[PDB]
Design a binder for this molecule. Structure first.
Ligand SMILES: Cc1cc2nc3c(=O)[nH]c(=O)nc-3n(C[C@H](O)[C@H](O)[C@H](O)COP(=O)(O)O)c2cc1C
Length: 147
């Protein structure tokens, strides 16, 4: 099994979440390729991968903005190879805002309409993910079961 994890992180919280999911998948025997969205290229990005996990933090406060590094990839998601691809999404936000983790919904919706296969409901972390380390580890185990 080959997994790709692509994350957008401004203060490092979704990055830490992606490091935690990557270690759980690697420990299970998966080959994991983890990339920061600041430097990936959308075209053909998902091709070759059995599983693709997209992480992105929510910003915006009065409206939904995706983490700034992620916006180019999200804008190019039709070009990635998402149709028929098993995917799931994750991100950090704060439930005191009106659209809590609205970036994870936006990316899930977009993937669904592209004919991707969402294998697990998105992981939406409220607060410091270092304080939710066990729900992250749990969701990573769940996604492996869903493929
Ligand atoms: C000015 C500001 C606005 C934010 N807006 C939202 C929001 O609209 N929804 C949400 O869930 N979280 C929101 N957040 C919380 C960030 O998503 C949270 O701090 C997250 O941990 C950042 O993850 P990152 O380090 O991976 O980019 C906001 C934070 C700040 C400082």
């Amino acid at each position: 099994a080959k997994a790709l994890i692509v994350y957008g992180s401004t203060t490092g919280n979704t990055e830490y979440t992606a490091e935690t999911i990557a270690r759980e998948l690697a420990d299970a025997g998966y080959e994991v390729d983890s990339r920061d969205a600041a430097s990936v290229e959308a075209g053909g990005l998902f091709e070759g991968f059995d599983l693709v996990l997209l992480g992105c933090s929510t910003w915006g406060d009065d409206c939904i903005e995706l983490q700034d590094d992620f916006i180019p990839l999200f804008d190019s998601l039709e070009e990635t190879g998402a149709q028929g691809r098993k995917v799931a999404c994750f991100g950090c936000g704060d439930s005191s805002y009106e659209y809590f983790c609205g970036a994870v919904d936006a990316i899930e919706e977009k993937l669904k309409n592209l004919g991707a296969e969402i294998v697990q409901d998105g992981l939406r972390i409220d607060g410091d993910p270092r304080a939710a380390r066990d729900d992250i580890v749990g969701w990573a185990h769940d996604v492996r079961g869903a493929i």
